[PDB]
Amino acid sequence: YYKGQTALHIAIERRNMTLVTLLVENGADVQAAANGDFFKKTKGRPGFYFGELPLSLAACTNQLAIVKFLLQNSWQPADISARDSVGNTVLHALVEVADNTVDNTKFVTSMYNEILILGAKLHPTLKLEEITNRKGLTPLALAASSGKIGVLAYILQREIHEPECRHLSRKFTEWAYGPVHSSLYDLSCIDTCEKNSVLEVIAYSSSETPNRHDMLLVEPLNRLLQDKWDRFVKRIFYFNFFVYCLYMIIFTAAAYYRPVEGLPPYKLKNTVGDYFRVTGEILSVSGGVYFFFRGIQYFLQRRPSLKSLFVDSYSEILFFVQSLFMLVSVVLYFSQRKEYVASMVFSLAMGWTNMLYYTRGFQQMGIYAVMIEKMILRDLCRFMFVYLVFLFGFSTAVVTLIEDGKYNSLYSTCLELFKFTIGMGDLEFTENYDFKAVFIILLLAYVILTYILLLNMLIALMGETVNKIAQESKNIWKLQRAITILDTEKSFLKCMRKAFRSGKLLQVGFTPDGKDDYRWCFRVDEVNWTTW
Amino acid sequence: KSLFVDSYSEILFFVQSLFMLVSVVLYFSQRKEYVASMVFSLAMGWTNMLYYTRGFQQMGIYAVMIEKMILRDLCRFMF
Amino acid sequence: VYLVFLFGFSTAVVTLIEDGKYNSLYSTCLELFKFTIGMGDLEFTENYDFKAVFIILLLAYVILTYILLLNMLIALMGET
Amino acid sequence: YYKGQTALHIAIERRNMTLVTLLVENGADVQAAANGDFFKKTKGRPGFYFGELPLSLAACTNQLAIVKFLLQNSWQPADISARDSVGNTVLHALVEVADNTVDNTKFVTSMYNEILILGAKLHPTLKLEEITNRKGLTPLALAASSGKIGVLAYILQREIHEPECRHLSRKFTEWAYGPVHSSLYDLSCIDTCEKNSVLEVIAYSSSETPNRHDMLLVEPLNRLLQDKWDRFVKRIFYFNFFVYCLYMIIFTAAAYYRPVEGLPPYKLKNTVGDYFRVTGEILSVSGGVYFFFRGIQYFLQRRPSLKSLFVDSYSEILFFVQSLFMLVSVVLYFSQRKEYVASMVFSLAMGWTNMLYYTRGFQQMGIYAVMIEKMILRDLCRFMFVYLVFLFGFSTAVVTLIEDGKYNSLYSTCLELFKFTIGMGDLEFTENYDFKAVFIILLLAYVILTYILLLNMLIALMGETVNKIAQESKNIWKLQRAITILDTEKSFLKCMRKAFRSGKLLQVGFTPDGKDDYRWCFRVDEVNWTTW
Amino acid sequence: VNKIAQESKNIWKLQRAITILDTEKSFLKCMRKAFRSGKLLQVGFTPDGKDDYRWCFRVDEVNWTTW
Amino acid sequence: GKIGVLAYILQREIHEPECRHLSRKFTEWAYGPVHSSLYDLSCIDTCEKNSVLEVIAYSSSETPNRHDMLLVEPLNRLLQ
Numbered sequence A, D: 001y002y003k004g005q006t007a008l009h010i011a012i013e014r015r016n017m018t019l020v021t022l023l024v025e026n027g028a029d030v031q032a033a034a035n036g037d038f039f040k041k042t043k044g045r046p047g048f049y050f051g052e053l054p055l056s057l058a059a060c061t062n063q064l065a066i067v068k069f070l071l072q073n074s075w076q077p078a079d080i081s082a083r084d085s086v087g088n089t090v091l092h093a094l095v096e097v098a099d100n101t102v103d104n105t106k107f108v109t110s111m112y113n114e115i116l117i118l119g120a121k122l123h124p125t126l127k128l129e130e131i132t133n134r135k136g137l138t139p140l141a142l143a144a145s146s147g148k149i150g151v152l153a154y155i156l157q158r159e160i161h162e163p164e165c166r167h168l169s170r171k172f173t174e175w176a177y178g179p180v181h182s183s184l185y186d187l188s189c190i191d192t193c194e195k196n197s198v199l200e201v202i203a204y205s206s207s208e209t210p211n212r213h214d215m216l217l218v219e220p221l222n223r224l225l226q227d228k229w230d231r232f233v234k235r236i237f238y239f240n241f242f243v244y245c246l247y248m249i250i251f252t253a254a255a256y257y258r259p260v261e262g263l264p265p266y267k268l269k270n271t272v273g274d275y276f277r278v279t280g281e282i283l284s285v286s287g288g289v290y291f292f293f294r295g296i297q298y299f300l301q302r303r304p305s306l307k308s309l310f311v312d313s314y315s316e317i318l319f320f321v322q323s324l325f326m327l328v329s330v331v332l333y334f335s336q337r338k339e340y341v342a343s344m345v346f347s348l349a350m351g352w353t354n355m356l357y358y359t360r361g362f363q364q365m366g367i368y369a370v371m372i373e374k375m376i377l378r379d380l381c382r383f384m385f386v387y388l389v390f391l392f393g394f395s396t397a398v399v400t401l402i403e404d405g406k407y408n409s410l411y412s413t414c415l416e417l418f419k420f421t422i423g424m425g426d427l428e429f430t431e432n433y434d435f436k437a438v439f440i441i442l443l444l445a446y447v448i449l450t451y452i453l454l455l456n457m458l459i460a461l462m463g464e465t466v467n468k469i470a471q472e473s474k475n476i477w478k479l480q481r482a483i484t485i486l487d488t489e490k491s492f493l494k495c496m497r498k499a500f501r502s503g504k505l506l507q508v509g510f511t512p513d514g515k516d517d518y519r520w521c522f523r524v525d526e527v528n529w530t531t532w
Numbered sequence B: 001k002s003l004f005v006d007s008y009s010e011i012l013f014f015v016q017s018l019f020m021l022v023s024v025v026l027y028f029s030q031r032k033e034y035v036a037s038m039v040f041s042l043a044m045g046w047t048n049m050l051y052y053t054r055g056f057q058q059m060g061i062y063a064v065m066i067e068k069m070i071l072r073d074l075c076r077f078m079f
Numbered sequence C: 001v002y003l004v005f006l007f008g009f010s011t012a013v014v015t016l017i018e019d020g021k022y023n024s025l026y027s028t029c030l031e032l033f034k035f036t037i038g039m040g041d042l043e044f045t046e047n048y049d050f051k052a053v054f055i056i057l058l059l060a061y062v063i064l065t066y067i068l069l070l071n072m073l074i075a076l077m078g079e080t
Numbered sequence E: 001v002n003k004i005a006q007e008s009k010n011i012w013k014l015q016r017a018i019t020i021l022d023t024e025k026s027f028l029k030c031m032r033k034a035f036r037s038g039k040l041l042q043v044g045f046t047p048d049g050k051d052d053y054r055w056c057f058r059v060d061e062v063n064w065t066t067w
Numbered sequence F: 001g002k003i004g005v006l007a008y009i010l011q012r013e014i015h016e017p018e019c020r021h022l023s024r025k026f027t028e029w030a031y032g033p034v035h036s037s038l039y040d041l042s043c044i045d046t047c048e049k050n051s052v053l054e055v056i057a058y059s060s061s062e063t064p065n066r067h068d069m070l071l072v073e074p075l076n077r078l079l080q
C-alpha cells in the first residue's frame, strides 16, 4: 500500500529542507519510486499521485528550493528525465496535479517554467517536452487531453525573456514598431504531428474532458482554426453542402413520383420519366450506402463509449440512422413488401432535417441548431415523461368514463386529449357517457394542468438564460466547426499540401548548438497603447 | 396550515385512497356513480407518479416547480 | 430551419399518401403549416397505408416545431 | 428681474465671510427681499429660488458660518421666522432646494438640524416647523407634497442627542434593556391635523410627486398604515367586499331573468318570481345611483387635472362608468327602447371586472391587479395601434382581392384575419378571387408578421422585468392600500374614535418651559446585536 | 432571477432526505446495515483514561494553499 | 432553524490540548495538499429522541432555514 516510500519522501512531505539535505548527504536514493497503491491515481481509493519520485514530489508540493537542491546537489543529482511506472516525468506530474483553479494554476505554471529553465541549463541537449509516457502523450498533449486549460494556456503562449532560454519559448516577438507588435506562435505539435496534436486531442475528446469547449478559445488555436477555415475548408464545406442539396432534391423527386401499383419491385417502362425515376432511385440508394459506410468508419475510428455516443457524435448518428432507414427500405423493396415506403419516408424526413448539420460554418444558424440539439438531448425526456404521465392518466380516466362510444379506446381518447395541446381540443367530442359533470371536470382539469406544465417548462428553461445558453452554444458551435475543419483536412480529396498553414519562419537561428530553428510559426499582430 | 405547503404528496395519495374507497362503497351500494369516483382515483393514480420523480434531480426539480405552482400561484390567477 | 423541417415532413407525408385528395406538395405543406397556427387537423386524410407511420410523422413534426419555437424564444431572450 | 438684490446677497454668493461681516457692520439690511423674477421659481425662465432672504441664501448655499453670524451678530440679528413673498421661511427654502440626491440631501439635512438647534436656543418659545407658507404648508407638509423623500425621511425619524434640544426630536427612545430597545415616533401632523397631514398629502398627490410610491416606505408611515389596517380597516374593507358581492349577485340574477317580450317597461305580474325580479332591479338601480354620486363626490373633492385623471383615480373612473351605463340603461328602459339591454350588459360586465378593485388588501392579488391596470394604461395603446395597422392593411388588401364574394367587406375580412390571432384562422375561408397565389401569400405574410409583432411585444415587456415591475407594482399596491385606509377612516360609518391610534404617551415631559408634552406617539421595537 | 432554480433544487433535496428517512424507518427486513460510516477511534484521549469511539464519517478534501 | 450555529457545531474543530475531545470535526490524516477528516455523526444519524436529520426533515415548515440546513457538508454527504 505504502510500497516504495522512504525517508526522503517523508522529509519532502514535511517540507524540511534540512532533513532532505542530510538524507541526500547520507546516501539516500533520489530516484526511489514510491509505487504503492496510495501513491497511484486509484480513483476508488484515497491517495495522492505525484509521479512517485522525490523530484516530482517536491515539484508537485510547491517546494522550489528542494527541487533546485535535488537537481544539482553535490552528492547524487536527481535525474530530471526520469519516468515513473506510468511513464510520467516531472512535467507530466505537474500537468496531472492541475485542476484549473487560480492558485493551483499559478504555482503549477511557475514550477513548470522553473523546471524547464533548470533542465535547459543543466542539459541543453535534452528536450523534456518531447518525452512521452506509456500512453504516448507529451505534457502538452496530456494537458490538452485532461482539459487542464490553465496549463495548456500557459504553454501555448509561453514566452521566456532571458539569454540562453529563448529556444524554450513558444511565443516570440518578430518585430515591434510603435504600439503595434507582431508575435509568432510556434505551432509545433498543434497543427500536426505523428500521434497527438493539440487540435486532434481536443476535438476528438470523449466529452469527459472538463473544458473541451473552452480550450479552443486560447488565442493561437482560435486564430489558427479561423485561418484554416477561411483559407482551405470554407469552399470545400460549401461544395459538400451543395452536393447534399442535390442529393436530397433527387431523393425527394424520386420518392415523390413512386408508382402506386402494389407488389414491388416495379417493372421499368420504356419511357423517359421512368428512366429518370429509376436513375434517381439508384442515386438515392448509392448515397445511402455512402453514408452507411461513412458512419461505420466513424464509429470504428472513434469507438464511442455508449454515453459519449449521444451527447457527442450526434450528427453522425443521425446520418447513420438515415442510411439505415434507406437500406431497410431497399431490402423491403426487393422483398416484395410495400412496407418499404414506411422506411423510405422516414429516411426522407431525416434527410431533410440533417440539413441542420450544415448550419455550422454560419455562427448564428449554427448556434440555433446547437440549441435544438441540446434541448432534444438534455431536456426532452424529462418534460415528455411528465406530459405523457398527465396525458395517459387523464386519457385512461376519460376512456373509462366513456361507455360503448365511437372513441371508447386508449388510442382515440389519447389523440383527442392530445388535440388540446395543439389548440384543437373539441371539449365536447362525445356524449356516450353518464355523469357529464365528471367528463367536463376531467377535461378542464387536464387543460389547466397541461398549461401549468407548459408554463413551468418555459420558466425552467428560462433559468439557464443568464448568459449560460448563449456562451455555451457559441463555444459548442466553435468546437463543432473545429471538428469539421479537422475532418475536411483528413479527407482533403486531391492530395493537396496547401492545408499546412502559417509558413516556415525562423524564430532565433541560435539553438543551444550552432544550428538554426525553423519551426513553422504563425503570425499575429497586436496593438498595446500602454506599457511603452 | 402546514398541511398543504408540506405533506403535499401524502395528501394526494390519501385522497386517491378516499376516491377508491368511495368507489367501493358505491359499487356495493348498487349505484353506477361508483364509476365517477373510480375514474378520479385513476387519474390521480397516474399523476401521483410524479411523487417518484424525487431521486432524479432534474425531474424532481420540475415536479417541485409544478407542486409550488399549484400551491402558491394558481389561486390568484384562477380567481 | 422552420422551412427545412416543414418541407422535410411535407415530403415524407405526401410520399406516404397514395392517390388522395391532397397528394401534392402544396396541399400537404399548407396542411402541415396549419399546425403552427393552431389549426392542424391531425386526421386530414386516410388515403394511405401504414396509419402508424402517418400519425408518427405528424406527432414528430408537431413536437419538433414546438421545440423550434421554444428555442427561438430562448435565443431571443438571450439578448434581453 | 434682479429687483431687490443688495450687496449682502452678492457677498453671500461669492462666499466672502469678511465682506458679509463688513456689510452687516456698516448697516446692511439683513431682511432685504430679493424678489426679482430671477430669484423666483419661474420654471419657464432661468433663475434660482432660495427664499429671497440673506439668511435663506446662506442656508441654501451650504454656508453654515454665515448663517450663524447672521442669526448671532451684534449689529442686526436676522429674523429666523421671516417669510418671503411666497410665505416660505428658511426651512421651507431648505425643503424647496432638495432634489433627493445624496450630497444635496446630506447638506440640506445638516443645515436643517443646525437651524432648528439655533432657533431653539435663541427662541425657545418659537415653533419654526408650525409656520405655514401662503399655501398653508408646513416644512414637513411641503416636503411630503413635493416628494422630497430624503428630507421627509430625515424629519420623520429625527432624534437630537443633546440637552435642551430633546423637545425638537420626533423619534424618542423609550427604553433599552439589552440589544432590544423601544422607540417612539411623534405622529404629530402625520396621523391627523387641521389642514395637511403627511398621509393625506402623500396619498392624495396629483401623481406628479416624483416619490409618492417610495415615501410610504419610511418606517413610521409603513408601520402606522399596517397598524391602521389590522386594527380598524381590515374588517370594514371585507364587509364592503361582501356587500359588493351581494350587489353583483343580485344584479346578475335580475339581468339574467329579464323578460323577452318587446317594448319595455314591462308589466309587473302578480307572481313571486316577478316580485323578486323587480326587487333585484330596484336594488341594482339603487347601487348604480350610489356609485354615481360617490364618483361625483370623488371628482369634486379631488379635481383631477385630466392627465392625473387616468394614471391615478383609475378604479374611481371604472366604478363611475359602470354607474353611467346603469343610468343610461334606466333611461332607455323607461324610454321604451330595447337598447337598454345594450347598456345593461356592459355595466354587468364592468360590475364583475371591478371586483379586481378589492384585490387590494391581498398583497399578491393586488400586485397582479396593479400589473393589469398599468399594462392597460401604459402599454395597450402602442401595441394595439401597431397591430391594428397591420390587420387593417392586410384586410384591405384581401378584401380588395376578393371579387363579389360572400365576405367582400371590411368587417367580414377583418374578422377572418383577426381569427388568426386567436388560433382559428381558416386560411382558405373563400375562393371568390383570381390569383390564388396572391391571396395565400397575403395571408401567410400577415400570419408571420403578426407572430413577429406578438414576439416583439413579449420581448419589449420582458425588457422591464429586471426587478422593476415587481417592486414598482408592490409599492403601487401599498399606495393603493394607504388610499383605501384613509378613505375608510374618512367614512368611519359609526362616529368611532378608535381610528386615532398609538395612544397618548409622555415623551419627555420637559419642554423649554415647565409644561409636560404628550405627543401621541407610536411604539416600535427594534433589536441591534452590534454597537453595544 | 436565480431564485426559483436554487429554491426548487433545495426543496428537492429536502424531499429526498424525507424519503431516505422514511425508507430507513420502514427497512422491511430487520436490517442493521443502514447504520453507516463505521466505528472509528477519533482521539482516544477522553478526560479520563478511556478511548472514544464515535461512529465517524470520513471525508477527503484537497487544499492547494496553506501548506 | 439557526443555520449559523448548526453549521458551526456540526464541523467544530478545536486545536489545543485538553479540548480535542470537544471537537466534532477531526483530521484523520494529511499527506500533502490532500487530507482526510472525520465528522462525528453523534446525534445526527440516530439517537434516542431528536436526531438532526429527523428534526430538520420533520419540521413544521415554520423553521426558517429547513431548505438550507441540509446544505451543511456532513449532512449533504451523509444523505447522498
Ligand SMILES: C=C(C)[C@]12C[C@@H](C)[C@@]34O[C@](Cc5ccccc5)(O[C@@H]1[C@@H]3C=C(COC(=O)Cc1ccc(O)c(OC)c1)C[C@]1(O)C(=O)C(C)=C[C@@H]41)O2
Pocket (backbone or CB within 6 Å): A314, A315, A316, A317, A318, A319, A321, A346, A349, A350, A351, A353, A354, A355, A356, A357, A369, A370, A372, A373, A376, A380, C059, C060, C063, C064
Ligand atoms: C435523438 C435521436 C437520434 C432521434 C433520431 C430521429 C428518430 C429523430 O427522432 C428523435 C426522437 C424525437 C422524436 C420526435 C420529436 C423529438 C425527438 O430525435 C432525434 C431525431 C430528431 C430530429 C431533430 O432534428 C435535428 O436534430 C436536426 C439536426 C440538428 C443538429 C445537428 O447537428 C444535426 O446533424 C445531423 C441535425 C429530427 C428526426 O431525425 C427526424 O427528422 C425524424 C423523422 C425523427 C427525428 O430520435
Ligand SMILES: C=C(C)[C@]12C[C@@H](C)[C@@]34O[C@](Cc5ccccc5)(O[C@@H]1[C@@H]3C=C(COC(=O)Cc1ccc(O)c(OC)c1)C[C@]1(O)C(=O)C(C)=C[C@@H]41)O2
Pocket (backbone or CB within 6 Å): A444, A445, A448, A449, B008, B009, B010, B011, B012, B013, B015, B040, B043, B044, B045, B047, B048, B049, B050, B051, B063, B064, B066, B067, B070, B074
Ligand atoms: C392540491 C389538491 C390536493 C388537488 C388534489 C386533486 C384534486 C388534483 O386537483 C387539485 C386542484 C386542481 C384542479 C385542476 C387543476 C389544478 C389544480 O390540485 C391538486 C391535484 C392536482 C394535481 C397536480 O398533479 C400533481 O401535483 C402531481 C404531483 C406533483 C408533485 C408531487 O410531489 C406529487 O406527489 C403525489 C404529485 C393532479 C390531480 O390530483 C389529478 O390528477 C386530478 C383528477 C385533480 C388533481 O387539488
Ligand SMILES: C=C(C)[C@]12C[C@@H](C)[C@@]34O[C@](Cc5ccccc5)(O[C@@H]1[C@@H]3C=C(COC(=O)Cc1ccc(O)c(OC)c1)C[C@]1(O)C(=O)C(C)=C[C@@H]41)O2
Pocket (backbone or CB within 6 Å): D314, D315, D316, D317, D318, D319, D321, D346, D349, D350, D351, D353, D354, D355, D356, D357, D369, D370, D372, D373, D376, D380
Ligand atoms: C381604461 C378604461 C376606463 C376602460 C373602461 C372599460 C370600457 C373597460 O375598457 C377599457 C378599454 C379596453 C377595452 C378592451 C380591452 C382592453 C381595454 O379598458 C378599460 C376597462 C378595462 C377593463 C380592465 O379590467 C380592469 O381593469 C379591472 C380592474 C383592475 C384594477 C383596478 O384597480 C380596478 O378598479 C375598478 C379594476 C374591463 C372593462 O371595464 C370591462 O369590463 C368592459 C366591458 C370593458 C373594460 O376602457
Ligand code: NA
Pocket (backbone or CB within 6 Å): A422, A423, C037, C038, D422, D423
Ligand atoms: Na391555438
Ligand code: NA
Pocket (backbone or CB within 6 Å): A422, A423, A424, C037, C038, C039, D422, D423, D424
Ligand atoms: Na386553434
